[PDB]
Structure formats: structure tokens, C-alpha cells
Amino acid sequence: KTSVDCTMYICGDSTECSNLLLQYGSFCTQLNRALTGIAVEQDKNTQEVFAQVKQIYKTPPIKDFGGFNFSQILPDPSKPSKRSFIEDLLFNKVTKFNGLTVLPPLLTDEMIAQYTSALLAGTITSGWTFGAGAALQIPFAMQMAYRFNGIGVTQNVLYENQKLIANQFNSAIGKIQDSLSSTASALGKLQDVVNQNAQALNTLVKQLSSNFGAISSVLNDILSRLDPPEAEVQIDRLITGRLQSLQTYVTQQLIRAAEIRASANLAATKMSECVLGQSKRVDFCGKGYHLMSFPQSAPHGVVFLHVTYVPAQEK
């Protein structure tokens, strides 16, 4: 959530520059308004992606989940910020005073972790019912029986192969753990987003070092060196240049924020139809027949663990 003060960026501590800038009307008002809208939109995106559970459910101490082991996604009571193992991995795999500020997000990472915990606990202890209405408990084995019936495989397949399925799920979660711990580029997308923004800001700041046709990129030197009749033209040049740079940055931010809003809408749809329920849309929730999903927070992003069913041995 970046915010830029045009008056201090264009005319840092200079009354004459501000007087000249005041000629250009309401450029600052609309630029600040656009950036404020961007920040509000980011807050809304996070709110709608994560804040989809009416209450905050919490898993009971007993972990009799039909043999399934969620200890790698449930919150750790002895942890830095009550984050799960995979959440901590995701957080650890992702990495001034010139009118540019970074507003803080409305929902702190602890709150996002609490939201993911509530959604995950609802999914574990109630299945999909907690999304439709009041949470209705159910043994996890029977929930997986529902899911198998949901993918056209009769339920007896599960109960006759419960231990094998539980072991396979645990092995898959372990493999995901190892992959995330080993390969840092896996979270590329999120990192990429960050990178882009930084570059933008950097470019913007570097525009302060361009003369835009003036005699010097430093406003103070122009003010102190030249007479007002020509210093006025020079500062007009500088103001035009800096305003154009700011406009380019704001337009790029608007386009990238539209992209990120599309991504956040997609993530919200995936969380609604994939986690809170069971999707029958092919390749919308992982290759193969979809069984369930588990959300996980990440810095300015979400990570879905898609549990899916794939026939292997054919005759």
C-alpha cells in the first residue's frame, strides 16, 4: 500500500516550487485519490479472499482424524505468531523519506493466520457444512467417504483402503514440505509481485536525478544560482518532468493493481469453491479429480494445498 506526497516529491522544501506547482490545478488531488483507492482496493482484496468464515473455529486437542495428520497445517501453539509449518516456510521464502510511504495492511499477518486457522478447522471438523451454515461435526473418515461418493467412487473403496489413503496423504504432505523447503523459486509469483513494485518506486526515485532539459537536477542549486526570470522556466521544466514521471508510475500501479485484483478474485473463487466445498470443475483445483483443499497464508498472498484423487494402475 504505497502512497506518494506529490508536493514533497516534486517540490521538496521549496516555497517557489510549490507556488509554480499550484498552477497545474488538481493533479495531486487525483493522483493521491488514485493511490488511496489502490490501497483501499488491496484491503478489500485481502478481506474478501480470507474473511470468508463467520466465526473462529478451533481444533479440539484430540487429533483422531481417521489417521489423517494435519499437524503441518494447524497452528503451532509454540510458534512465533501461531503460524503453521508450511505458513512459516512460505513467510521465510519471500523477501524512504522522500515523499514515499508504505501504509500498513489493515489485517496483520497474525489476523490472516487466525482466519486461515478458522477456515482450516472448519474444513477439518465439519467438512463443507460450516460454509453453508452452522458447523456440523463429522468424523473425518465419513467426510472423505462423502468426497469419494462425490467423485463417482463408491464409499467402500475408502473404508477398505483407509490406512493406505491416510499414509498416501501424509507422504504427499511431506513431499510438499520438502519441495517448499528446498526450492525457493516455488513462490516466484509472490516474490515477482514484490520485485515489480520495488523497481517502480526505484525508477520513480531515480527520476529525481534527471534534468528533464534543465541545467541541474537539483532544485536548490537552480534557485540559488539563476535569477528568478529564468529559474522560473527551469523549475517549470523540472515540475513538468517530475509530474510526468509520477503520472507514469501511477498508471503502471493502476494496471498492476487491476492484475492483482483479478488474481485476488480468482483466489477468492478458488477458496469458496475449492476449500469450503468440493469442485467438479476439471483442472480448476489441481490435476485429477478434486477431493479437498487447505488454505495457507503467505506474504500478500494465499497458497492452496489441493488434495486430489488420481487413478494410477489400469487394466
Binding site: 522544501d13 466465526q55 500498513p104 495492511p105 489493515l106 496483520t108 456440523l136
Partner: protein, 163 residues
Amino acid sequence: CVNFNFNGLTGTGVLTESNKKFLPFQQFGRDIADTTDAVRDPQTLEILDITPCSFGGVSVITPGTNTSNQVAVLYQDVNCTEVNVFQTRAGCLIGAEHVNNSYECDIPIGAGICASYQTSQSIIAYTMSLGAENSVAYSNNSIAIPTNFTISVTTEILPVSMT
């Protein structure tokens, strides 16, 4: 906060004792984004870090003027010393009564803090609640089944076209 003019450069900022080791021939520091960072004092052989003077937006949190005219002021990203005062990660909040009870967010401030006008009546800032907690009585041989139902009509609004 001083407006300074060293050997050939001029600027505004706060000069502080530094931690860097300039070479005997280096005069002016520079950050990654081509910004002056430290200077060598021409007389005293000491390196001074240039931290630009504190500044930030002044947001005005208000309930609608229809209801009342009382307001609170949030100075963004500053300590409350340089300005019923609340020091939050978003900055210094003045005019807001800090309560412990959590409520649904009405006017977002930031970093989990939201302000609102509540009851005799005043502006309060609180750590917003995510909803009433609950525990599901989960056990390996217990299932909860509904016996009644409700038909709910919800409303979803979508813009389609501009002017």
C-alpha cells in the same frame, strides 16, 4: 531538524552520529537509489548520517457529520512525542479512547486497529474482532445432523456498465 549546506551539497534533515567507516578521501555518502545518505564534516573528521526530518500524512477519522462533529486525528508513522493519546503501529492517534473490548471494524486505521463512534458517546480505537470464537465438539463417532432448515434470500450487487 536543520537545513544544512556542506562543502558542495545542500539539503534538509537531521544529522546523527554514524556507524559507517568512510575512506580518508570520501566526502558524501549515497544510498542505493542515488540519494545522499552521509557526509564528512569539513572541520571535524566525523561522519554524519543524514536522516530526513520526520513527516507524514494527517488523516482525520470522523463519524458522519450528520451524526456528530467530534473527530480524531491520526498522524501517520510518527511517535506521539513529536506532535487520551494512542501510539499504534500506524502512528499517533489523538482524540480516540483506547478500549480493550474488540468489535467489528467500522473505520479502518491500520495494523489491526479500527476506530468508531460508540457510547456519553465518544470515539474509540480497538483491535478489531474477527468474530465470536467457537469450538466444534468433534469426536470420531459423533455427527451433527440438521433437523430443520431456513430458506435465505441474499443480495449480490454487480456493476455492469459505465456512463
